């Protein structure tokens, strides 16, 4: 479910144009950054939020890769 909440925080499943991450950062592309809920990400336990261009980065810690796998499945299912 947290994965569904993360998708909603970015704006929505259709607002996601790409999914990728590294060891402690999650990268999610968004069509409109004005629709990202920075406050929503914080409540989800995000340590911080960083936005670069149209790409959005959220710090979920080392478990960030877990969100990538869950979001990838939920967004593809």
């Amino acid at each position: 479910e947290m994965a569904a909440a993360l998708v909603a925080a970015f704006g929505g499943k259709e607002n996601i144009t790409n999914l990728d991450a590294c060891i402690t950062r999650l990268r999610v592309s968004v069509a409109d950054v004005s629709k990202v809920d920075q406050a929503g990400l914080k409540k989800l336990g995000a340590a911080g939020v960083v936005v670069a261009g149209s790409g959005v980065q959220a710090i979920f810690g080392t478990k960030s890769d877990n969100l990538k796998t869950e979001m990838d499945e939920y967004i593809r299912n």
């Binding site: 060891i23 911080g48 710090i59």
Partner: protein, 150 residues
């Protein structure tokens, strides 16, 4: 006192000088960084490998002493999709200090990786009494890089 041995050879660098805010701000834990000069990453302590990234460029290990470490080779190296790395150990493998976990191609990574700086941090910060960071050049599986208590 637990001694963390260098996972790779190189020069110790401040973790706050790493070009990544999550590592520099120690969101993923505290420790040091190493500018690599060798070709392999070994176990910095006797324990069990926990997780190896599918891009075979970073891994997690828990010492028998109960310390959780996390080694991340280079910065944003996941974008290389495994190029330059070869996983030699398996997740769940029990290892002793110096056991090889991954071998890498320094020259190829020095040319394609945004940075080869390699953070070695403790993700168990709330369970350790003190972390003493050391300094200087280290030799893989031989030179201690950090000293911890409790």
């Amino acid at each position: 006192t637990i001694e963390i041995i260098a996972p790779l050879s190189g020069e110790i660098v401040n973790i706050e000088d790493v070009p990544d805010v999550v590592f520099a701000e120690k969101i993923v834990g505290d420790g040091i960084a190493i500018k690599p000069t060798g070709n392999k990453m070994v176990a910095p302590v006797d324990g069990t490998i926990g997780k190896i990234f599918e891009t075979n460029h970073a891994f997690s290990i828990e010492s028998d002493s109960g310390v959780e470490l996390f080694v991340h080779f280079g910065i944003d190296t996941v974008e290389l999709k495994g190029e330059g790395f070869k996983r030699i150990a398996e997740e769940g493998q029990r290892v002793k200090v110096g056991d090889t976990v991954i071998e890498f191609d320094l020259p190829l990574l020095e040319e394609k990786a945004k940075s080869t700086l390699t953070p070695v941090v403790i993700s168990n910060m709330d369970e350790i009494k003190e972390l003493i960071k050391l300094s200087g050049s280290v030799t893989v599986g031989e030179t201690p890089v950090i000293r911890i208590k409790k």
